C-alpha cells in the first residue's frame, strides 16, 4: 500500500491567527480552511 498526505505548515503568525479564529468561533479547527 501507498498513500499521500497533505500537511499544512504554519508560521508563528498564522498559528496565532488560526487560534484567534477558533477562539472567535469563526472556524471549528485551525485547519478548517474555507472561503
Amino acid at each position: 500500500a501507498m498513500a499521500a498526505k497533505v500537511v499544512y505548515v504554519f508560521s508563528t503568525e498564522m498559528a496565532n491567527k488560526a487560534a484567534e479564529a477558533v477562539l472567535k468561533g469563526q472556524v471549528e479547527t485551525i485547519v478548517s480552511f474555507h472561503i
Binding site: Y8, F10, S11, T12, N16, T29
Partner: protein, 57 residues
C-alpha cells in the same frame, strides 16, 4: 538541542517546537512568539506543523 532563536537548551519541561518546514531545529515556544493556546492547537492537530520564520520566508 539548542534553541534556534536563543541558543539555550530546549529542555523537557519547556514547550518545545520543531521546525518541520525544512531546518528541523528545535525552539522554545516562547522564543517563537507563538501563544500557548496556538501551540496547544497546533500540536493536537495531526495535519498541521510549524515552520520557523527563516524557512517560511
Amino acid at each position: 538541542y539548542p534553541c534556534g532563536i536563543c541558543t539555550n537548551e530546549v529542555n523537557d519541561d519547556q514547550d518545545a517546537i520543531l521546525c518541520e518546514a525544512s531546518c528541523q531545529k528545535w525552539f522554545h515556544r516562547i522564543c517563537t512568539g507563538m501563544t500557548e493556546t496556538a501551540y496547544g492547537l497546533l500540536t493536537a492537530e495531526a495535519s498541521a506543523v510549524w515552520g520557523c520564520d527563516t524557512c517560511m520566508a
